[PDB]
Write a protein that holds these residues in place. Structure first.
Motif, PDB file in Angstrom:
ATOM      1  N   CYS A  30       0.790  -1.237   0.000  1.00  0.00           N
ATOM      2  CA  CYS A  30       0.000   0.000   0.000  1.00  0.00           C
ATOM      3  C   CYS A  30       0.835   1.307   0.000  1.00  0.00           C
ATOM      4  CB  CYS A  30      -1.017  -0.011   1.135  1.00  0.00           C
ATOM      5  SG  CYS A  30      -0.280   0.192   2.772  1.00  0.00           S
ATOM      6  N   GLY A  31       2.152   1.184   0.095  1.00  0.00           N
ATOM      7  CA  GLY A  31       2.984   2.369   0.174  1.00  0.00           C
ATOM      8  C   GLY A  31       2.955   2.971   1.568  1.00  0.00           C
ATOM      9  N   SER A  32       3.745   4.028   1.773  1.00  0.00           N
ATOM     10  CA  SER A  32       3.842   4.709   3.058  1.00  0.00           C
ATOM     11  C   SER A  32       3.851   6.226   2.851  1.00  0.00           C
ATOM     12  CB  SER A  32       5.090   4.246   3.800  1.00  0.00           C
ATOM     13  OG  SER A  32       6.223   4.290   2.952  1.00  0.00           O
ATOM     14  N   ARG A  33       3.821   7.004   3.956  1.00  0.00           N
ATOM     15  CA  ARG A  33       3.814   8.464   3.891  1.00  0.00           C
ATOM     16  C   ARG A  33       5.073   9.076   4.501  1.00  0.00           C
ATOM     17  NH1 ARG A  33      -1.615  10.815   3.531  1.00  0.00           N
ATOM     18  NH2 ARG A  33      -3.124   9.137   3.127  1.00  0.00           N
ATOM     19  N   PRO A  34       5.919   9.807   3.728  1.00  0.00           N
ATOM     20  CA  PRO A  34       7.067  10.473   4.359  1.00  0.00           C
ATOM     21  C   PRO A  34       6.590  11.678   5.159  1.00  0.00           C
ATOM     22  CG  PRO A  34       7.332  10.273   1.952  1.00  0.00           C
ATOM     23  CD  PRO A  34       5.884  10.098   2.281  1.00  0.00           C
TER      24      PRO A  34
ATOM     25  N   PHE B 107      -4.173  -0.271  -3.491  1.00  0.00           N
ATOM     26  CA  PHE B 107      -5.447  -0.698  -2.911  1.00  0.00           C
ATOM     27  C   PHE B 107      -5.518  -2.209  -2.711  1.00  0.00           C
ATOM     28  CE2 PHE B 107      -6.843   3.204  -5.248  1.00  0.00           C
ATOM     29  CZ  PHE B 107      -7.457   3.884  -4.212  1.00  0.00           C
ATOM     30  N   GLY B 108      -4.477  -2.943  -3.061  1.00  0.00           N
ATOM     31  CA  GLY B 108      -4.471  -4.393  -3.014  1.00  0.00           C
ATOM     32  C   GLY B 108      -4.536  -4.953  -4.414  1.00  0.00           C
ATOM     33  N   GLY B 109      -3.552  -5.786  -4.722  1.00  0.00           N
ATOM     34  CA  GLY B 109      -3.459  -6.480  -5.999  1.00  0.00           C
ATOM     35  C   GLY B 109      -3.762  -7.948  -5.819  1.00  0.00           C
ATOM     36  N   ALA B 110      -3.947  -8.666  -6.947  1.00  0.00           N
ATOM     37  CA  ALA B 110      -4.168 -10.111  -6.985  1.00  0.00           C
ATOM     38  C   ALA B 110      -2.845 -10.731  -7.477  1.00  0.00           C
ATOM     39  CB  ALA B 110      -5.346 -10.453  -7.887  1.00  0.00           C
ATOM     40  N   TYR B 111      -2.158 -11.474  -6.587  1.00  0.00           N
ATOM     41  CA  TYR B 111      -0.807 -12.031  -6.820  1.00  0.00           C
ATOM     42  C   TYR B 111      -0.828 -13.522  -7.007  1.00  0.00           C
ATOM     43  CZ  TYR B 111      -0.527  -7.647  -4.179  1.00  0.00           C
ATOM     44  OH  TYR B 111      -0.733  -6.353  -3.762  1.00  0.00           O
ATOM     45  N   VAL B 112      -0.048 -14.028  -7.968  1.00  0.00           N
ATOM     46  CA  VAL B 112       0.109 -15.471  -8.197  1.00  0.00           C
ATOM     47  C   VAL B 112       1.570 -15.817  -8.467  1.00  0.00           C
ATOM     48  CG1 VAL B 112      -2.275 -16.074  -8.972  1.00  0.00           C
ATOM     49  CG2 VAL B 112      -0.542 -15.443 -10.692  1.00  0.00           C
TER      50      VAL B 112
ATOM     51  N   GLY C 159      -7.106  -1.921   4.413  1.00  0.00           N
ATOM     52  CA  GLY C 159      -8.164  -0.927   4.514  1.00  0.00           C
ATOM     53  C   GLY C 159      -7.831   0.500   4.194  1.00  0.00           C
ATOM     54  N   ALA C 160      -6.590   0.779   3.843  1.00  0.00           N
ATOM     55  CA  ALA C 160      -6.171   2.132   3.483  1.00  0.00           C
ATOM     56  C   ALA C 160      -4.956   2.114   2.591  1.00  0.00           C
ATOM     57  CB  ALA C 160      -5.869   2.937   4.736  1.00  0.00           C
ATOM     58  N   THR C 161      -4.766   3.197   1.826  1.00  0.00           N
ATOM     59  CA  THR C 161      -3.579   3.378   1.018  1.00  0.00           C
ATOM     60  C   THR C 161      -2.590   4.223   1.824  1.00  0.00           C
ATOM     61  OG1 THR C 161      -4.397   5.331  -0.228  1.00  0.00           O
ATOM     62  CG2 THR C 161      -4.796   3.130  -1.189  1.00  0.00           C
ATOM     63  N   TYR C 162      -1.323   3.944   1.614  1.00  0.00           N
ATOM     64  CA  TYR C 162      -0.230   4.694   2.179  1.00  0.00           C
ATOM     65  C   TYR C 162      -0.258   4.762   3.681  1.00  0.00           C
ATOM     66  CZ  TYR C 162       0.404   5.885  -2.650  1.00  0.00           C
ATOM     67  OH  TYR C 162       0.549   5.835  -3.993  1.00  0.00           O
ATOM     68  N   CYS C 163      -0.533   3.634   4.318  1.00  0.00           N
ATOM     69  CA  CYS C 163      -0.587   3.545   5.775  1.00  0.00           C
ATOM     70  C   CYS C 163       0.612   2.777   6.353  1.00  0.00           C
ATOM     71  CB  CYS C 163      -1.917   2.969   6.259  1.00  0.00           C
ATOM     72  SG  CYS C 163      -2.252   1.284   5.721  1.00  0.00           S
ATOM     73  N   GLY C 164       1.464   2.252   5.471  1.00  0.00           N
ATOM     74  CA  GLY C 164       2.680   1.530   5.827  1.00  0.00           C
ATOM     75  C   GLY C 164       2.430   0.223   6.532  1.00  0.00           C
ATOM     76  N   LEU C 165       1.304  -0.437   6.215  1.00  0.00           N
ATOM     77  CA  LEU C 165       0.905  -1.711   6.807  1.00  0.00           C
ATOM     78  C   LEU C 165       0.735  -2.771   5.731  1.00  0.00           C
ATOM     79  CD1 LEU C 165      -1.787  -0.466   9.421  1.00  0.00           C
ATOM     80  CD2 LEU C 165       0.669  -0.692   9.781  1.00  0.00           C
ATOM     81  N   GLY C 166       1.063  -3.999   6.103  1.00  0.00           N
ATOM     82  CA  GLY C 166       0.960  -5.117   5.191  1.00  0.00           C
ATOM     83  C   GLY C 166       0.108  -6.247   5.711  1.00  0.00           C
ATOM     84  N   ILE C 167       0.329  -7.425   5.122  1.00  0.00           N
ATOM     85  CA  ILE C 167      -0.364  -8.674   5.417  1.00  0.00           C
ATOM     86  C   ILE C 167       0.704  -9.767   5.653  1.00  0.00           C
ATOM     87  CG2 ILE C 167      -2.619  -8.063   4.278  1.00  0.00           C
ATOM     88  CD1 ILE C 167      -1.462  -9.953   1.883  1.00  0.00           C
TER      89      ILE C 167
ATOM     90  N   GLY D 128      -3.152  -5.706   8.359  1.00  0.00           N
ATOM     91  CA  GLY D 128      -2.663  -4.446   8.905  1.00  0.00           C
ATOM     92  C   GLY D 128      -1.513  -4.553   9.885  1.00  0.00           C
ATOM     93  N   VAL D 129      -0.574  -5.480   9.632  1.00  0.00           N
ATOM     94  CA  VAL D 129       0.632  -5.682  10.448  1.00  0.00           C
ATOM     95  C   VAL D 129       1.701  -4.661  10.034  1.00  0.00           C
ATOM     96  CG1 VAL D 129       0.216  -8.160  10.866  1.00  0.00           C
ATOM     97  CG2 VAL D 129       1.651  -7.480   8.932  1.00  0.00           C
ATOM     98  N   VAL D 130       2.668  -4.382  10.908  1.00  0.00           N
ATOM     99  CA  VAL D 130       3.785  -3.536  10.507  1.00  0.00           C
ATOM    100  C   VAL D 130       4.684  -4.449   9.669  1.00  0.00           C
ATOM    101  CG1 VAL D 130       5.801  -2.171  11.197  1.00  0.00           C
ATOM    102  CG2 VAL D 130       3.626  -1.878  12.416  1.00  0.00           C
TER     103      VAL D 130
END
Length: 389
Positions: A105-109, A251-256, A326-334, A370-372
Motif C-alpha cells: 500500500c505504500g507509506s507516507r514520508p 489498494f491491493g493487488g491479486a498475486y500469483v 483498509g487504506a492506502t499509504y498507511c505503511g501496513l501489510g499482510i 494491517g501488520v507492521v
C-alpha cells in the motif's frame, strides 16, 4: 535386547509416498531412530524399558498433496519380544511454496508526498525438501485494482485460467536458485534502503537485502545489488514497455506464483491461444496472459477493504476470499498465519526445526491484516546465494 513391532495408523488418505519418516525411541539414557517407508515396521536391538516413542515425516497423496505427519506414544511398556505398539499418526496438509508476507500500500514520508516504492513479496519454502526457484513465474492479475465491473473472457477458456496483467519469471538454468525448508525469497519493486532521507525515513523496511527485484531501469530509482527478475509479458509483448516501476495496486493487488511443468509449453506472447483482450471492451487492444489455474503454486487476493468481496479476480479454487489493510499509504501489510494446534501452539517441522504456515486457499482466513511489515519474520532464513553474502 528385544524386537518391537510398530504399527502406524496414518490418518492421511490415499498415501503415495512416506518421505523422511522416522520412529524415534527416547529415554532418560537409550535413544533409537528407525527409518520407515510402510504402515508397519519391526524395530530390532531395542533394550527393554519404558520409552517415549515419536513419529515424524512427510506423506504425499495420489494427487501430489503434501502432508506433515506426526504422532507419539508416551511411556509405552516395551519388555516382551515381539511386543506390538500402535501409534496414531495424524497429518497436516502443507502447501509447498507460499506467499509468507506481502507489503503493497505504500507509506507516507513526514517530508511530504507519498512513497509507493517500498513494495515487497516474501516467498517461503514451506515443504519437506529443497525447491528450485529457477524459471518459476510471478504475476499480478487484472483488473489491477479490484472492481465490480466484470471482464468477459473467451467462452472457449471455460474456467481454466486466471488473467495476468504483467508476468515475470525467476532467472536460472534449473539448479541456480534453491530454497531450503525454512528459507525465504524476497522480491522488492525497488530493492533499496527506503529509510534513507532521499526516499522515506518512515518506510517500515530496508529493502536492500532482498534476494530479487523487479528492475525496470528507472533513471532516478535505479538497479540495485539485488538480482533481477526476467520480464515475460505485458500487453501482449515480451518487452517491459513505457511503465517506469512495477507498481501493483496500492489498494491491493491479486498475486500469483506458478510453475510450468518440464515438457509443457506456455507462451502468452507468441501463442495467441494464451492471450486475450477483455471481450466486454470491444475497442480494446489491452492483452492479458492466460495463466492455467492448474500451474498455480499460490494465489493471494488483496482488495481495498472488507467491502470488496464481490470484486474478486483470483479464481475461487486458488483463493476463495479477500485480504486487505483498509487504506492506502498507511505503511501496513499482510502476513500469513502459522499452522497452530488446538492449544494454539505453532506446529514445528522437527526434521528442519522450522515453521509451517497456514494455507487453506482463503486469504480472509490465512492472513493477519494491517501488520507492521517485517522482512524474514519468525526467523525465516536468507538463502546462501543472496547478493550480500
Amino acid at each position: 535386547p528385544i524386537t518391537v513391532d510398530v504399527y502406524l495408523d496414518i490418518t492421511v488418505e490415499n498415501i503415495s509416498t512416506l518421505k523422511d519418516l522416522t520412529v524415534k525411541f527416547d529415554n532418560y539414557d537409550l535413544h533409537y531412530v528407525k527409518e520407515v517407508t510402510d504402515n508397519s515396521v519391526k524395530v530390532d536391538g531395542i533394550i527393554p524399558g519404558i520409552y517415549s516413542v515419536t513419529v515424524s515425516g512427510t506423506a504425499i497423496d495420489t494427487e501430489n498433496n503434501e502432508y506433515y505427519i506426526n504422532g507419539n506414544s508416551v511411556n509405552a511398556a516395551l519388555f516382551k519380544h515381539g511386543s506390538a505398539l500402535n501409534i496414531e499418526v495424524q497429518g497436516l496438509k502443507v502447501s509447498p511454496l507460499i506467499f509468507k508476507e506481502i507489503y503493497y500500500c505504500g507509506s507516507r514520508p513526514e517530508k511530504g508526498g507519498v512513497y509507493f516504492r517500498d513494495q515487497f513479496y516474501e516467498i517461503y519454502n514451506n515443504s519437506a525438501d529443497i525447491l528450485y526457484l529457477d524459471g518459476i513465474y510471478f504475476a499480478n492479475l487484472t483488473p489491477g485494482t479490484a472492481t465490480t465491473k466484470l471482464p468477459i473472457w473467451p467462452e472457449a477458456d471455460g474456467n481454466n485460467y486466471a488473467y495476468g496483467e504483467r508476468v515475470w519469471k525467476f532467472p536460472g538454468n534449473g539448479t541456480e536458485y534453491p530454497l531450503a525448508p525454512g528459507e525465504s525469497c524476497i522480491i522488492s519493486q525497488f530493492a533499496a534502503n527506503h529509510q534513507l532521507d532521499i526516499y522515506n525515513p518512515q518506510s517500515p523496511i530496508d529493502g536492500s537485502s532482498s534476494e530479487f527485484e523487479f528492475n525496470m531501469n528507472n533513471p532516478n530509482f535505479p538497479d540495485q545489488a539485488a538480482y533481477d527478475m526476467q520480464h515475460v509479458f505485458y500487453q501482449g509483448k515480451a518487452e517491459m514497455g513505457s511503465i517506469p516501476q512495477y507498481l501493483t495496486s496500492v489498494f491491493g493487488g491479486a498475486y500469483v506464483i506458478f510453475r510450468v511443468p518440464e515438457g509443457e509449453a506456455w507462451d502468452p506472447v507468441n501463442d495467441e491461444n494464451m492471450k486475450t483482450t477483455d471481450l466486454s471492451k470491444p475497442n480494446s487492444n489491452v492483452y492479458y496472459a492466460k495463466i492455467p489455474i492448474k500451474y498455480v503454486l499460490d494465489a493471494v487476493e488483496a482488495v481495498n477493504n472488507e467491502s470488496k468481496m464481490n470484486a474478486k479476480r483470483v479464481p475461487g479454487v486458488l483463493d476463495a476470499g479477500i485480504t486487505w489493510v483498509g487504506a492506502t499509504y498507511c505503511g501496513l501489510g499482510i502476513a500469513r498465519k502459522l499452522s497452530t494446534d488446538e492449544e494454539g501452539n505453532p506446529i514445528i517441522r522437527e526434521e528442519t526445526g522450522t515453521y509451517i504456515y497456514q494455507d487453506t486457499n482463503n486469504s480472509t482466513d490465512d492472513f493477519e491484516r494491517g501488520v507492521v511489515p517485517v522482512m524474514r519474520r519468525n526467523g525465516a532464513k536468507m538463502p546462501s546465494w543472496n547478493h550480500t553474502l
